[PDB]
Design a protein around this motif. Structure first.
Motif, PDB file in Angstrom:
ATOM      1  N   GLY A 220     -66.310 -62.780  55.128  1.00 31.66           N
ATOM      2  CA  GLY A 220     -66.042 -61.627  54.043  1.00 31.66           C
ATOM      3  C   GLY A 220     -67.249 -60.936  54.058  1.00 31.66           C
ATOM      4  O   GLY A 220     -68.310 -61.095  54.600  1.00 31.66           O
ATOM      5  N   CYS A 221     -66.906 -59.973  52.887  1.00 29.33           N
ATOM      6  CA  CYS A 221     -68.089 -58.971  52.826  1.00 29.33           C
ATOM      7  C   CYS A 221     -68.229 -58.818  51.252  1.00 29.33           C
ATOM      8  O   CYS A 221     -67.445 -59.247  50.478  1.00 29.33           O
ATOM      9  N   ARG A 222     -69.420 -58.382  50.480  1.00 29.82           N
ATOM     10  CA  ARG A 222     -69.692 -58.238  49.119  1.00 29.82           C
ATOM     11  C   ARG A 222     -69.928 -57.009  48.851  1.00 29.82           C
ATOM     12  O   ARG A 222     -70.511 -56.837  47.712  1.00 29.82           O
ATOM     13  N   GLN A 226     -66.270 -48.835  49.632  1.00 35.90           N
ATOM     14  CA  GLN A 226     -66.351 -48.130  51.015  1.00 35.90           C
ATOM     15  C   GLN A 226     -66.164 -48.866  52.083  1.00 35.90           C
ATOM     16  O   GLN A 226     -65.134 -48.965  52.567  1.00 35.90           O
ATOM     17  N   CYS A 227     -66.926 -49.954  52.359  1.00 38.35           N
ATOM     18  CA  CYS A 227     -67.094 -50.923  53.520  1.00 38.35           C
ATOM     19  C   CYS A 227     -66.825 -49.993  54.669  1.00 38.35           C
ATOM     20  O   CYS A 227     -66.050 -50.402  55.852  1.00 38.35           O
ATOM     21  N   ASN A 228     -67.399 -48.691  55.078  1.00 40.06           N
ATOM     22  CA  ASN A 228     -66.987 -47.846  55.516  1.00 40.06           C
ATOM     23  C   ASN A 228     -68.176 -47.456  56.646  1.00 40.06           C
ATOM     24  O   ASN A 228     -68.338 -46.559  57.775  1.00 40.06           O
ATOM     25  N   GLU A 240     -61.009 -55.200  59.353  1.00 40.23           N
ATOM     26  CA  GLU A 240     -60.653 -54.877  58.231  1.00 40.23           C
ATOM     27  C   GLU A 240     -60.753 -56.062  57.339  1.00 40.23           C
ATOM     28  O   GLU A 240     -60.612 -57.265  57.669  1.00 40.23           O
ATOM     29  N   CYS A 241     -61.269 -55.750  55.864  1.00 37.25           N
ATOM     30  CA  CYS A 241     -61.553 -56.789  55.097  1.00 37.25           C
ATOM     31  C   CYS A 241     -60.308 -57.940  54.896  1.00 37.25           C
ATOM     32  O   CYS A 241     -59.246 -57.197  55.196  1.00 37.25           O
ATOM     33  N   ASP A 242     -60.708 -58.971  54.721  1.00 41.06           N
ATOM     34  CA  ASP A 242     -59.650 -60.215  54.503  1.00 41.06           C
ATOM     35  C   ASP A 242     -59.256 -60.072  53.121  1.00 41.06           C
ATOM     36  O   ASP A 242     -60.115 -60.706  52.177  1.00 41.06           O
ATOM     37  N   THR A 248     -64.697 -58.428  46.284  1.00 36.61           N
ATOM     38  CA  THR A 248     -65.654 -57.222  45.536  1.00 36.61           C
ATOM     39  C   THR A 248     -65.296 -55.953  45.834  1.00 36.61           C
ATOM     40  O   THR A 248     -65.463 -54.885  44.929  1.00 36.61           O
ATOM     41  N   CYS A 249     -64.691 -55.703  47.125  1.00 39.34           N
ATOM     42  CA  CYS A 249     -64.722 -54.156  47.407  1.00 39.34           C
ATOM     43  C   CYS A 249     -63.295 -53.646  46.884  1.00 39.34           C
ATOM     44  O   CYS A 249     -63.103 -52.423  46.660  1.00 39.34           O
ATOM     45  N   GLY A 250     -62.238 -54.517  47.016  1.00 43.04           N
ATOM     46  CA  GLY A 250     -61.102 -53.868  46.515  1.00 43.04           C
ATOM     47  C   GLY A 250     -59.843 -54.340  47.237  1.00 43.04           C
ATOM     48  O   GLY A 250     -58.765 -53.982  47.086  1.00 43.04           O
ATOM     49  N   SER A 261     -60.392 -48.715  46.245  1.00 42.30           N
ATOM     50  CA  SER A 261     -61.836 -48.534  46.458  1.00 42.30           C
ATOM     51  C   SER A 261     -62.340 -48.762  47.803  1.00 42.30           C
ATOM     52  O   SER A 261     -63.370 -48.370  48.241  1.00 42.30           O
ATOM     53  N   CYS A 262     -61.747 -49.915  48.365  1.00 44.15           N
ATOM     54  CA  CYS A 262     -62.319 -50.318  49.597  1.00 44.15           C
ATOM     55  C   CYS A 262     -61.276 -49.380  50.664  1.00 44.15           C
ATOM     56  O   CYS A 262     -60.159 -49.269  50.776  1.00 44.15           O
ATOM     57  N   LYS A 263     -62.201 -48.938  51.725  1.00 45.00           N
ATOM     58  CA  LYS A 263     -61.651 -47.883  52.459  1.00 45.00           C
ATOM     59  C   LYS A 263     -61.523 -48.490  54.088  1.00 45.00           C
ATOM     60  O   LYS A 263     -61.019 -47.847  55.006  1.00 45.00           O
TER      61      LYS A 263
END
Ligand SMILES: CC[C@H](C)n1cc(C)c2c(C(=O)NCc3c(C)cc(C)[nH]c3=O)cc(-c3ccc(N4CCNCC4)nc3)cc21
Ligand SMILES: [Zn+2]
Ligand SMILES: [Zn+2]
Ligand SMILES: [Zn+2]
Ligand SMILES: [Zn+2]
Ligand SMILES: [Zn+2]
Ligand SMILES: [Zn+2]
Ligand SMILES: [Zn+2]
Ligand SMILES: [Zn+2]
Lengths: 517, 355
Positions: A220-222, A226-228, A240-242, A248-250, A261-263
């Motif tokens: 995953g990511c921290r 956005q994540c964009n 796409e985020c798990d 943390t992103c949403g 929040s996470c796009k």
């Protein structure tokens, strides 16, 4: 032989009276009407009729019909939003009961549950739940306890609170006497170069059963939001985020919401922008967009049927004769097909200078096709994308190809999450199983519909999923006498490692609160 | 059992793919039928001594349309007849032969339309069988698409014919997918559509009328015929349907004694009750018909033999004439079952009378 010849006419004659008695009521309704007849036209280019037998040749003027605007060709397809895969033990609840082991009473549940999408006998993932994914006095009352000794361990005063029909310690005597991802599984063996994920060049996901800190799991990511951009390893891995990892992103925040929040998770939630149908400016049907869209913004999931490569080869025979192919390569092994089942965006025509593009992203194990804007798109452009890389106007309805006048084209959105035909189609597939009893069947039907109604897509959600199921459908649980099978559903949820223990206590508590009422 | 007395021919020499007598004729009023073909519908009257009189004709604005079929129907409160016609363009015009103008038109079928029928007890509900793999139930009175028959479990190939049952409770369709599919219309879910399609009003609610997509038939089977099916009419609780196999076939679905109003979708067995064997009829789109009391059964072929059948086999009587040469697409009896009109490929008509 002489028997069947005799049954033909006894049924014919009884069927004959049905013809007589019915046809009379139509005839009796005919004596009710005094309808005017057809008469010649002297009111008004000319039509003529000759006779091949010696008779005056008759001529009359030709009344011309006003022209009517035709619509382009369209074939019968079915609404869809989540993809569709295609192919190329007694009841323990009511009067007749039995006492079987832990695995025989739950057997249908472990094999019919899908760890990835949370439904029974799902429509995407054909492979059944892998072996270690589901390991983390009458005959009915005793077979229940038999389920709990693997689950409830040694707690005696609590097991009695569940079964309800007995009490605490007396229980003692029973104790006395690019490839597609699939979850990897291998006890006593680490995820090495013999693992299907390593062999397939896929990271193990949360569904894998390898070690917790396996060197092949995506973490995953921290990101904060956005994540964009390339900075986020989820985006950078074309994923796409798990939503059980990227906390943390949403992607795990406000699952009800659509603009999070996470796009980089707009596909799994289904936050697809509004699409509209009209005749294409090239030729045929084309898709236009309602509201404006930025550069590299998500438009829709290009959705359809999941077919094998070998099934895609046979269908490529029939498709070739109309110079019109609607299939796209999802990965090396599978192909998506929008010809029979698809969604609104399947009407994007080809163009080599397009304003959209296809990106084959990854969502919780499932490869999906996303459509994104190549540049910025304002109100009322027709959306195109290049088929090669992956393989003041009149608007029309989606389901019926009727004109959708502007009066109510704002919150129409003929694209929900659970269509009418799927809600029934899953009922067709539950009942058809000949090896599963019908007491357990009538509960899995209730769960499948509950899942689709809300749109669950995260493991962390399942506490709320099983607590919301009781609040709404638990009434049908008692009226249809399935309170025991619902408990089997809970310990199967708890066997699959995705529900809290105190929720199983909290769920039964909310069922018994209405049961004793 | 019959006798031919007249032959006709039009001014376009193009095939005619169907005729119907307006069975909503009054008592004591002259017999009238209508002819579809090319881009033109022609209406006709009967008279004494085999005279066939030409009433009126309508041509559509473009010559690209090739009409296929038609069916009659009366208006509820204006008492005029209406003859809905539909063809290759998939448009269904109404064309009342009173004021002689296209009173209504309904676009929006995915392809051509291959057969039309009306509900027996409601002259406002029109069913269209289309090339777009789907049946559709319109509503002439209120301009509303009621249903769409054919989604996931629908007709996977091109559909060519259907027919209501007698009382008006259960449709049966078939097409180029070798399948015959029963779609009941007496369930309270289909019924509350017919009810609410009347009490719909375009400027009374900013919401288009909810059209009912039927994805799952109430029975399906591909066990009767081998190749494609191009015609089907009910027989009360039995069903007749032909194929390019030179045989009309009778069959009931389910077991023998299992009632048709209790057979539930997942039934897979049939019961072939026999065949009407004929010869030389084996091409695309060749229907039959039956009289109003369903004792007659009339079929034509490609060389001009105009078969007939007695349905009370509780008798392959044939009709042939020296000039009857081209193919026979469709036949239609009069309501009193006295006159048999058949149409041809070379734009000709033949009139046969019973005695
Ligand atoms: C073996 C089946 C065959 C391959 N197949 C499958 C589908 C879904 C489909 C369609 C169809 O659903 N389209 C709607 C449509 C979509 C979905 C999308 C876009 C961008 N645009 C569209 O229109 C049409 C045709 C067809 C055949 C001949 C034809 N011609 C004759 C008349 N003269 C012009 C050329 N036109 C269209 C075939 C189809
Ligand atoms: Zn699944
Ligand atoms: Zn205790
Ligand atoms: Zn793995
Ligand atoms: Zn592994
Ligand atoms: Zn691993
Ligand atoms: Zn991120
Ligand atoms: Zn992420
Ligand atoms: Zn994220």
């Amino acid at each position: 032989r002489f028997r069947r010849a005799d049954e033909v006419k006894s049924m014919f004659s009884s069927n004959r009276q049905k013809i007589l008695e019915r046809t009379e009521i139509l005839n009796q309704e005919w004596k009710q009407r005094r309808i005017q007849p057809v008469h010649i036209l002297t009111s008004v280019r000319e039509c003529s009729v000759t006779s091949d037998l010696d008779f005056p040749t008759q001529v009359i003027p030709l009344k011309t019909l006003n022209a009517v605007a035709s619509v382009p060709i369209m074939y019968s397809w079915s609404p869809l939003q989540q993809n569709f895969m295609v192919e190329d033990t007694p009841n323990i609840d009511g009067p007749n009961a039995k006492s079987v082991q832990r695995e025989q009473s739950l057997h249908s549940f472990h094999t019919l549950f899908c760890r990835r999408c949370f439904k029974y006998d799902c429509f995407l993932h054909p492979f059944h739940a892998t072996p270690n994914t589901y390991k983390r006095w009458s005959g009915a009352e005793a077979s229940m306890f038999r389920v709990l000794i693997g689950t409830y361990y040694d707690n005696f005063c609590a097991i009695a609170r569940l079964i309800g029909t007995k009490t605490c310690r007396q229980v003692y005597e029973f104790r006395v006497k690019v490839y597609n991802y699939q979850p990897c599984d291998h006890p006593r063996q680490p995820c090495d170069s013999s693992c299907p994920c390593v062999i397939a060049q896929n990271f193990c996901e949360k569904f894998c059963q390898c070690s917790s800190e396996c060197q092949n799991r995506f973490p995953g990511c921290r990101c904060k939001a956005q994540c964009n951009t390339k900075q986020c390893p989820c985006y950078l891995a074309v994923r796409e985020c798990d939503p059980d990892l990227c906390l943390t992103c949403g992607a795990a925040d406000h699952r009800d919401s659509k603009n999070v929040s996470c796009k980089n998770c707009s596909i799994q939630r289904g936050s697809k922008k509004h699409l509209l149908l009209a005749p294409s400016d090239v030729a045929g049907w084309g898709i236009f967009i309602k509201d404006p869209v930025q550069k590299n913004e998500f438009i829709s999931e290009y959705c359809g049927e999941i077919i094998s490569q070998d099934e895609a080869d046979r269908r490529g025979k029939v498709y070739d004769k109309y110079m019109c192919s609607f299939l796209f390569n999802l990965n090396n092994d599978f192909v998506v097909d929008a010809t029979r089942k698809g969604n609104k965006i399947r009407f994007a025509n080809h163009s080599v200078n397009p304003n959209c593009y296809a990106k084959v992203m990854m969502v919780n194990g499932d490869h999906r096709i996303g459509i994104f804007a190549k540049r910025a798109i304002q109100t009322g452009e027709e959306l195109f994308f290049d088929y090669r890389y992956s393989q003041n106007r009149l608007y029309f309805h989606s389901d019926t190809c009727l004109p959708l006048r502007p009066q109510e084209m704002e919150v129409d959105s003929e694209d929900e999450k659970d269509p009418e035909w799927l809600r029934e189609k899953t009922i067709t597939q539950i009942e058809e199983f000949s090896d599963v009893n019908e007491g357990e069947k009538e509960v899995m039907k209730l769960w499948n519909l509950h899942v689709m109604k809300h749109g669950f897509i995260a493991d962390n959600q399942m506490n709320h999923a099983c607590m919301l199921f009781v609040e709404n459908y638990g009434q049908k649980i008692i009226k249809k006498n399935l309170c025991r099978n619902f408990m089997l559903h809970l310990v199967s949820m708890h066997d699959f490692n995705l529900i809290s223990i105190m929720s199983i206590d909290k769920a039964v508590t909310k069922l018994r609160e209405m049961q004793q009422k | 059992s019959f006798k031919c007395v007249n032959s006709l021919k039009e001014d376009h020499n193009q095939p005619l793919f169907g005729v119907q007598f307006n069975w909503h004729s009054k008592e004591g009023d002259p017999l009238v039928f209508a002819t579809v073909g090319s881009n033109r519908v022609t209406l006709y009257e009967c008279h004494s001594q085999g005279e066939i009189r030409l009433l009126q004709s309508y041509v559509d604005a473009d010559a690209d349309e090739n009409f296929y079929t038609c069916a009659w129907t009366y208006d509820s409160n204006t008492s005029h007849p209406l003859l809905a016609v539909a063809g290759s363009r998939g448009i269904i015009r109404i064309i009342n032969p009173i004021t002689m103008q296209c009173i209504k038109h309904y676009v929006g079928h995915g392809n051509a339309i291959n057969e039309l029928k009306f509900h027996p007890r409601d002259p406002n509900l029109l069913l269209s069988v289309s090339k777009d793999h789907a049946l559709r139930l319109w509503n002439i009175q209120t301009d509303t698409l009621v249903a769409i028959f054919g989604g996931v479990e629908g007709h996977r190939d091109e559909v060519l014919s259907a027919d209501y049952d007698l009382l008006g409770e259960k449709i049966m369709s078939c097409g180029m997918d070798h399948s015959l599919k029963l779609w009941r219309i007496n369930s309270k879910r289909m019924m509350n559509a017919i009810k609410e399609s009347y009490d719909y009003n375009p400027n009374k609610t900013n919401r288009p009328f909810i059209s009912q997509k039927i994805h799952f038939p109430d029975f399906s089977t591909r066990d009767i015929h081998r190749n494609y099916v191009d015609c089907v009419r009910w027989l009360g609780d039995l069903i007749l349907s032909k194929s390019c196999e030179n045989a009309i076939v009778c069959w009931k679905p389910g077991k023998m004694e299992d009632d048709i109003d209790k057979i539930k979708p997942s039934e897979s067995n049939v019961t072939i009750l026999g065949r009407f064997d004929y010869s030389q009829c084996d091409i695309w789109y060749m229907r039959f018909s039956m009289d109003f009391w369903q004792k007659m059964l009339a079929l034509g072929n490609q060389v001009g033999k105009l078969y007939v059948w007695d349905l009370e086999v509780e008798k392959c009587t044939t009709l042939t004439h020296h000039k009857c040469g081209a193919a026979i697409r469709q036949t239609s009896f009069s309501r009193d079952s006295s006159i048999l009109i058949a149409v041809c490929d070379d734009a000709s008509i033949w009139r046969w009378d019973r005695l």
